[PDB]
Ligand binder design. Structure first.
Ligand SMILES: Cc1ncc(COP(=O)(O)O)c(CN[C@@H](C(=O)O)[C@@H](C)O)c1O
Ligand SMILES: Cc1ncc(COP(=O)(O)O)c(CN[C@@H](C(=O)O)[C@@H](C)O)c1O
Ligand SMILES: [Mg+2]
Ligand SMILES: [Mg+2]
Ligand SMILES: [Mg+2]
Lengths: 379, 389
């Protein structure tokens, strides 16, 4: 019988009741907007996490690598969008997945990448499904939402080239820089409007564009309306994290992934407890540093998961985390409060970064038992 | 020659690997291994490399073949993997947690000469009571704080050293030594300050061992080291071994501390260009922070390299171009000086392969299930490494 007292530390624990509440909150919001949810599994890369998202009503998945496409397809999921601008050298891998039965969709934002796909498809007998990525907020990839000549030149390359022009997609990743409901709502409207504008421009040119796909977790939870959109992609919401708490779309109490750690020593004069969760456990992500409340390398909670405001990991080496007062003072008699061997749970800055440090999650049930749920590492 | 012809057909190079990949330039790696071992031989001290930078059996095998004595590990899973691969002299250099004692016992009962460390009377009492119960005289070293980096017993705290050392010795354990790590060396960037810190690290660790021996307690090993202080110490009188790990590859944090050049950096991430934002001067590559890690140790140093220094496919630095930003699977390649490069698409065409030098080799390596060990003939081989605990 494995439980939080028996596991070695550090371990990545998913509180299944918290995870199920986050899954239902997002699916209920997408149902209220009349759109499909295509979760981004790059947050967990774990078959049972994605199975719970499917069981609640999700439609297909988004993946960040073809390794995730291979994993999820070998587990029976066939409706897979690889939402990273396609590199031509990966075309043989993509072809072999489609010929095996995976309905794998690729994305592009240039004439040259569309040309490479379409020439390879014609040669190989494969009508690849490709969507066009639209830049709606200046974050990263994509055809500018008002760069119509580029949008139509790519769309005609794919459609006249014998490929299946399946849709447009955008990701308003600048939402991570926001922290008010008004700014998130307005960005969610800019994301929706730009993605719909590109679809209408394709359709107006006589090109197919059946899918309009938007999303980030903060804009998926903030959008007031989603007219014109067929699906939303969101991923970090399945666990949440402290970055999301500071953006304002969840509370710390909603964060379903924590790192179980043991106190292995102290520095009494500085008021430090040293734990065995360093940055190799937490990752080096320090997304909260650029936000209105800095949580260091994570927020401390007790073994029951009660948040302990005011204690955070103020520093981290590879295998040692430094727990101390966030107010800078040296806690008096820190060893008397957290004796050697005490177990604590640390909430992460960024769930996608912390999860990737572990070979598996420990999925925590209501009775206190855990089941190990493997996840993917690498490419 | 059936095996030959098939092996040739299957052989990878930097053109045929999928990206991103973590590439070890084996010539650079061997130059780093010989440099550290020669330095320690010249100092008359053993080198006990810290394998937590690579966690890879062939990398440790190269360090052992060059003359290393034992290893340091950061987790008991590293002690399990390297003992199964034939390494018997292993120091687990993280404050021992009582609940890990059954795994440390099982490793010693299989034949691993595993050493543990402590820095408190309670951890010493837990080891000694488990060892008496189980009939095992564990070997334990006392960790010393010589530069305020983390924690450890103060080198001048005779009453706490004696109490921890008597708890282990009177308890029937083998008090085997003292160790320190002057991790504050990562904040320095001059040879004068590094040499001084390495002397403070030596002096304080020997001071602790001299105090234990003055009370009649054994303390035969005195172990010091970080890569920067190993390379800078003038003298090592009284020290029996040095531990250093990131030197096997180096990285840009080390280049900035000034103990290596960018051309000594033996680990790089092979990446492909997958797109552009022409008006911002950006090339997008498939090495984001999941490949590089989120480490940004160069941001507070003399030269900020973002998420890494861009090199061409031949490994040569392309000055002025860095990964200025990174999302999980996408890295943003742009000018470090903040200008928008003109014709970025012509400077970096779609499908171009590049190599990115890491901020911190320990952090970048852990993002990969294996390295691709690049030989002089351009051939790679997959060298697995450990992930997790
Ligand atoms: C293309 C694409 N679609 C959906 C998501 C999921 O966003 P959430 O994690 O906010 O739900 C992402 C996430 N991208 C991360 C990243 O590191 O790439 C970031 C840009 O916001 C995505 O890229
Ligand atoms: C206990 C111990 N010994 C040796 C080293 C190796 O130092 P280099 O990597 O500089 O050769 C370390 C390294 N510790 C890292 C860390 O992330 O823990 C840091 C404090 O320098 C060490 O801890
Ligand atoms: Mg994320
Ligand atoms: Mg390191
Ligand atoms: Mg284990």
């Amino acid at each position: 019988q494995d439980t939080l007292l028996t596991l070695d530390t550090p371990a990545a624990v998913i509180d299944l009741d918290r995870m199920q509440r986050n899954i239902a909150r997002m699916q209920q919001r997408m149902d209220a907007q009349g759109v499909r949810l295509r979760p981004h599994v790059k947050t967990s890369k774990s078959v049972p996490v994605a199975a719970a998202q499917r069981a609640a009503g999700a439609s297909g998945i988004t993946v960040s690598t073809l390794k995730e496409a291979e994993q999820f397809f070998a587990a029976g999921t066939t409706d897979i969008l690889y939402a990273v601008s396609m590199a031509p050298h990966r075309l043989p891998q993509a072809l072999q997945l489609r010929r095996r039965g995976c309905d794998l969709k690729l994305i592009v934002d240039s004439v040259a990448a569309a040309q490479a796909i379409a020439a390879f498809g014609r040669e190989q007998g494969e009508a690849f499904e490709v969507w066009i990525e639209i830049d709606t907020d200046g974050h990263r990839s994509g055809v500018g939402a008002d760069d119509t000549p580029l949008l139509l030149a790519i769309g005609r390359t794919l459609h006249d080239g014998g490929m299946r022009l399946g849709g447009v997609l955008t990701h308003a990743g600048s939402s991570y820089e926001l922290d008010t409901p008004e700014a998130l709502q307005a960005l969610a409207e800019r994301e929706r409007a730009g993605c719909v504008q590109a679809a209408e421009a394709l359709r107006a040119a006589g090109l197919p564009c059946p899918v309009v796909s938007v999303g980030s977790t903060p804009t998926a939870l903030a959008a007031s309306r989603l007219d014109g959109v067929t699906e939303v992609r969101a991923g970090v919401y399945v666990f949440f994290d402290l970055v999301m708490r500071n953006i304002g779309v969840c509370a710390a109490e909603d964060v379903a992934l924590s790192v179980l750690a043991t106190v292995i020593g102290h520095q009494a004069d500085k008021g430090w407890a040293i734990v065995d969760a360093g940055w190799m456990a937490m990752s080096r992500d320090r997304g909260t540093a650029r936000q209105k409340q800095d949580f260091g390398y994570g927020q401390v909670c007790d073994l029951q998961g009660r948040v302990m405001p005011g204690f955070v990991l103020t520093g981290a080496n590879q295998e040692h985390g430094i727990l101390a007062r966030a107010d800078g003072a040296a806690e008096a008699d820190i060893a008397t409060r957290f004796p050697l061997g005490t177990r604590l749970r640390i909430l992460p800055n960024h769930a996608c970064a912390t999860g990737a440090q572990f070979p598996a999650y420990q999925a925590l049930a209501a009775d206190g038992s855990v089941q190990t749920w493997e996840r993917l590492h690498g490419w």
